[PDB]
Design a binder for this molecule. Structure first.
Ligand SMILES: [Ba+2]
Ligand SMILES: [Ba+2]
Length: 95
RNA sequence: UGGCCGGCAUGGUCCCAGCCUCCUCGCUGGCGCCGGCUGGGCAACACCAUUGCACUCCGGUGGUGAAUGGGAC
């Protein structure tokens, strides 16, 4: 069953050969236009590699970003996007 | 040589260039032949495995089984 709208968009199918720092930067390069970004979390661990959590301030930003960038060719791969299952702490720490 | 040893071979010291490397990337490192013993680390790099929902850093294996010429005394 799909996920409900969230402040954070979960992206996967990312190019696993990109260093964390760079990846966080690049992502910001293409997602910033959708709205303020509280943070982007990336990990290259066995379980978390190839995915990312972009955390937008306003749910609409994520939503917009979701519908707009779905399937976007990034580092030679089609970016897959969804809403995160739950709220990232940064967001909890408020609403 | 990342630590360690054994065989053999080989006049010496400099100078310039080239080249090499997971473990002090460069001019007060190294760049004959052969065999065996062993430590560290995934930091980089490669390869294998992975499509994975986090907010705790964290899969595995591999490399040195490396690299030549010239010139001054
Ligand atoms: Ba060396
Ligand atoms: Ba690794």
């Amino acid at each position: 069953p799909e996920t409900r709208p969230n402040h954070t968009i979960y992206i996967n199918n990312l190019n696993e050969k990109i260093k964390k720092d760079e990846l966080k930067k690049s992502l910001h390069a293409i997602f910033s236009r959708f709205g303020q970004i509280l943070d982007i979390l990336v990990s290259r661990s066995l379980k978390m590699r190839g995915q990312a959590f972009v955390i937008f301030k306003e749910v609409s930003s994520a939503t917009n970003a979701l519908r707009s960038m779905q399937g976007f060719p990034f580092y030679d791969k089609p970016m897959r996007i969804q809403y995160a299952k739950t709220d990232s702490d940064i967001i909890a720490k408020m609403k």
